[PDB]
Design a protein around this ligand. Structure first.
Ligand SMILES: *[C@@H]1O[C@H](CO)[C@@H](O[C@@H]2O[C@H](CO)[C@@H](O)[C@H](O)[C@H]2NC(C)=O)[C@H](O)[C@H]1NC(C)=O
Ligand code: NAG
Ligand code: NAG
Ligand code: NAG
Ligand code: NAG
Ligand code: NAG
Lengths: 321, 162, 162, 161, 321, 321
């Protein structure tokens, strides 16, 4: 005498929405939406990313004199460039199938850089010391790509060259080379005597004959000439043959490489740190179990679905009163 | 509001009761006291928890890297890619927005059901021995001591009285 | 049919009543009349409206131009694009078809609840002073004038009566 | 959700085998399980329609998923993979939840149907019997086979004490 | 005396469906599916589309003598072609990266066409008047593109030409040109005396050098020869250089341009009117707030999701007896 | 005398899940998830697939001597390769736009293969009998593609050849040809006397001038030369012209073809049987009405959506006790 029956209430002010009522105060509630990141570029599997810093992919593999300080990590989960990395192809030209390479290079399981064609003992009928440019400066002194050699004629003679590498590694070998297109027919012979030359690269799958296109281009980094960059993957046991009567920028360093496909490239100012994460964005990492997130649409890893919502509050308790 | 109990014929809630979601407030000679129904509260907590752990745990995603790179001569497939990202954006945003609206409505009705169900479960135990005020409260027609209430909230309530 | 009220123990509806969704039909000496429950009808309308304005207003889309152009040597990415369009077609068609099926079932149950809830809200008011026919209709055991009915539909119904 | 099934009516009757909901009368003529035809028949008609909605509303297009790309199309190959995985997560999640929700509702549907049946007879014979509390009523007068018939029939229109 | 409680009913026949029951009549209901369009091609942002009428994109920018009507329009939200516009490249050939252009040109925020290389003062060493063809007729008499000039030799002499334009506009400049491939070596010298010619186009990003491919192609519009069309965008401050010893169809008119990406092209006969719309389809415009529509899958703007459904009727009232 | 109200129960053990409770036993339930296939590769529309067996697409259309016992079928719904089928382009080279061709060939409505340039009466000025190779063996002895002819010089003379076919079929005609690139300039003249040759293929839409690229490639199937393959579709009433002074592997058989777009290619060992199916996967066919399936993501036809779920049991009855 008597017995009343009722429910709970507290000082809570958490509101949620329903199909029939908006802003309903309720005893308890959880959040389904993650909206918090650590503002750090973290490891992703268990392997840290590759940070290029001042340079971009192009400058990194070619060996631009400024990217001099970065190439060792034998594997990475993804690649990071800065929006203010401009050090790439210092000598104007076209990087064929560039963005594609970048994709292939986004994540790698093993990546060792070996000297494919040793500079000293490989080019015995050509000058391998005269190939520098003011476009690729190093120490105010003219320089060039570390991983490429700009073969010019040996004093009035550019004999047909023909070298070839056979992949004895136990994995794919990324090989990069270049074709130089002089601005004038005077520079053509000055560099490679012969006035009509041709370059041929061939493997078991690749085959392409290049013809120099001599003409005056508008000056880019003070060059009226151009230099196009090419790359290919050589299977294990397969060989690749270089042949040229001039205008060939030969490979000096190649890359033994094994690629675990399925990653990407992040262009961000966000500092790279020693932390584990299962999901990465350019603004930072996400450590969450929630089904949804509104931090960034571009994500890498096993991430929550990106949603436009500004709050996803799921009621657990009951009405307050 | 779907079962008429919560915010219905039982207007407010008890800031007093702090042991569970659902309970009682007895008022005999021994004294007054708020006591939350253990079993009922414990069952709801177990089910609501499972509910949240369903909406969350059923979202198993794949390891993929959204975002791709295209040159100035690939604006189309760049826009195709953008279309795929915006399509998935509208689909997930909408369903997540609605999934919450519906499961919110349902959850509140779940608690309403649990309260009403509790009201009925006691009201059919002691039919004549008490009268319905109409405010979710009953007024006993006989002395109900602490061990009398115990047998009502216990589900073991005998009926040899007037 | 989920709460037993509409199309349940109350078979049909009143073409007569035109002021709201739920109401009463009194029959005393002063006369007969249909009178819709203002408060109840007014609350449902407010909630159902919000329901429709949720299904609609939660769909916020992007500014995109679907449809792309490809040449006779891009049939693959043309088919990729077609796959993206057909994927989004099946997802939205299915989700929209089911969203309506579910929210229609619920909406009808919402009205059923509101009617039954109205029953009960009056039935407990006047426990003894009237008897349940079983057709949602009560038969008073005493003279109920216009200002008597007015206190039942008002929620302010005295029991010092018989 | 309605307190009937697994509520104030604890178990079910392995005995009854002619429908989902029914009765078990116990008079002098004998005991017997008899499933409510009309009620059972209506649920079966509605649950069937439910399954034939979740299924029949899934109308797909004629498309050939899966495309071929060469070693120089890894990007659009990954784009394609991204479209396939996006549709994988959307359908998997939606299908997983659609079942969880519609299972919860379906069980509540049966709970409603039982409770609704309990009330539909409880209000037909108010005084002529008492509520045990176990979903069972105890008549206050002799109820023969044709008496029960009129309760399960909905035509119990003559009050007799 | 009595009271009996109940619900509303009316003469309504609106049916809806539920998970449990089909064709349930109800008192009130709304439609979630928009199935009605105004059958008009309307403005989109606040700016009208670009209607090409008889011509397509190719014919429009090249200056086909038939597209010699207007379109001066300095901006448009999207582009409209008729299924029965066939006036494009009157001189058989290949429009390189055509589809891409069209997408670049789909929507523009400023678009003025200026004379890049004034015909009178630009070519004093070549004939800029014999360059017409029966393939590009204007009034039965031979003509040519209005934005291109078909330079030929000036009586037995085709001197190396070398022009260049520097973009002083505050915006990108679309530049179009052409390379002509004669059918026979007789027509080669008859047009440009030299038998072995070359054309070179170059900017800060572009560089290509074309070699005429002389051969007999099957007759198209009475030509056995071919003419390939090329285009490029020149950054502000950048310059583009033309150089050729024959076969070069030079730019006459260029286009100062600024492109707000994110639009498309509609191929429809639907009349273009003066009306505002937030969503456009080939069939007509859609003025709706509903979440879904079944009018057309191809849409432009902020549109409702396209759905196969025939009706999406949502119940608001209750069961109607 | 009592009257009780209750519900059904049985010996059923079927469990289902709900938002609130896991593993709830139930009286009746259906499955929404299809997880059963017939492990057969069946007809799709009403038309059986094209099974290449030992060969792949390339070897099939070129006429590789091993695919000798392959194509007659005048139409197919899709194409089936075995993971083991390695008989394709026996003579090393590059199949240009190969993937594209496969996609256009995936499904066809009519496909008859007629002799476009009859071997006997088409090449009276060139040798059409010496054109074999050890790379394309037919019974240990040297052979070549059935559908191509390797024209060589007729004893110290390779006159400019110039053939052309006009499509009088009522459908598109797939035409395949080849360009041969000898390894050494000695083999160049030994095959086609002239040291500087060119080949030209042209139609109303196609036009391309090929120049051989002579060089030593690494040995593939014992050839250090190469052979690139090309194809095109000729529209009804249109013509295609071949012209060459050497290095041209000419068409012998073409294909009158009509292609109902919208199919694919299955690479599976699964046996092909005589059965009808509305949905096909590499693993087998799917005969279901269910909305979902977890058999295979790669599907062809009108199929259930692929889902990761292991079970999707939908409760129909009520709790069981
Ligand atoms: C058809 O395929 C078979 C198998 O791939 C080819 O046989 C191979 O030939 C190479 C080169 O002589 C050998 O090194 C392999 O050992 C062979 N493999 C097998 C399984 O025999 C054959 O050359 C192909 N035939 C044609 C005409 O292309
Ligand atoms: C009230 O709020 C305070 C802090 O804001 C918190 O410590 C306390 O637990 C709350 N009261 C209850 C009953 O939860
Ligand atoms: C109410 O809730 C809505 C979301 O449903 C929110 O946008 C708004 O700010 C809230 N304001 C009030 C007064 O409830
Ligand atoms: C991150 O994970 C790596 C796995 O390689 C482990 O070695 C390291 O200890 C972890 N660091 C932190 C901070 O969890
Ligand atoms: C990039 O490197 C070049 C030398 O290769 C240097 O001259 C230039 O200043 C660098 N630019 C930037 C933005 O670091
Ligand atoms: C314009 O189109 C018609 C038919 O579409 C064609 O006959 C005519 O030659 C075209 N004119 C030009 C200049 O292309």
């Amino acid at each position: 005498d008597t017995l009343c029956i009722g429910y709970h209430a507290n000082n809570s002010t958490d509101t949620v929405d329903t199909v029939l009522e908006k802003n309903v105060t309720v005893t308890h509630s959880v959040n389904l939406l993650e909206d918090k990141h650590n503002g750090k570029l973290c490891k992703l599997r268990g392997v840290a990313p590759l940070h290029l810093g001042k340079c971009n992919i192009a400058g990194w593999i070619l060996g631009n004199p400024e990217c001099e300080s970065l190439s060792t990590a034998s594997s990475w989960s993804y690649i990071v460039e800065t929006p203010s990395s401009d050090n790439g192809t210092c000598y104007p030209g076209d990087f064929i199938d560039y963005e594609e390479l970048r994709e292939q290079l986004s994540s790698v399981s093993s990546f060792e850089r070996f000297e494919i064609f040793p500079k000293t003992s490989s080019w015995p009928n050509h000058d391998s010391n005269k190939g520098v440019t003011a476009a690729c400066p190093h120490a105010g002194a003219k320089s060039f790509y570390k991983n490429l050699i700009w073969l010019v004629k040996k004093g009035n003679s550019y004999p047909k060259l023909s070298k070839s590498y056979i992949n004895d590694k136990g994995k794919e070998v990324l090989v990069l080379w270049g074709i130089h297109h002089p601005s004038t027919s005077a520079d053509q012979q000055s560099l490679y005597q012969n006035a009509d030359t041709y370059v041929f690269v061939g493997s078991s799958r690749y085959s392409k004959k290049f013809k120099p296109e001599i003409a005056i281009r508008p000056k880019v980094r003070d060059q009226e000439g151009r230099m196009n960059y090419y790359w290919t993957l050589v299977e294990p046991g397969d060989k690749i043959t270089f042949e040229a009567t001039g205008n060939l920028v030969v490979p000096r360093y190649a890359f033994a490489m094994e690629r675990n496909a399925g990653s990407g490239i992040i262009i961000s100012d966000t500092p790279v740190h020693d932390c584990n994460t299962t999901c990465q964005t350019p603004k930072g990492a996400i450590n969450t179990s929630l089904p949804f997130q509104n931090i960034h649409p571009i994500t890498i890893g096993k991430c929550p679905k990106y949603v436009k919502s500004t709050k996803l509050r799921l009621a657990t308790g009951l009405r307050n009163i | 509001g779907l079962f008429g109990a919560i915010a219905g014929f039982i207007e407010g809630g008890w800031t007093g009761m702090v042991d569970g979601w659902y309970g009682y407030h007895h008022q005999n000679e021994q004294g007054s006291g708020y006591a939350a129904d253990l079993k009922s509260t414990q069952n709801a907590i177990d089910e609501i928890t499972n509910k949240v752990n369903s909406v969350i745990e059923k979202m198993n995603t794949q390891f993929t890297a959204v975002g791709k790179e295209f040159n100035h001569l690939e604006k189309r497939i760049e826009n195709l890619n953008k279309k795929v990202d915006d399509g998935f954006l509208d689909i997930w945003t909408y369903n997540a927005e609605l999934l919450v609206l519906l499961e919110n409505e349902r959850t509140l009705d779940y608690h309403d059901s649990n309260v009403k169900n509790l009201y009925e479960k006691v009201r059919s135990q002691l039919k004549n021995n008490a009268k319905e005020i109409g405010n979710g409260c009953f007024e006993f027609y006989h002395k109900c001591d602490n061990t009398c209430m115990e047998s009502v909230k216990n589900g073991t309530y005998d009926y040899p009285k007037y």
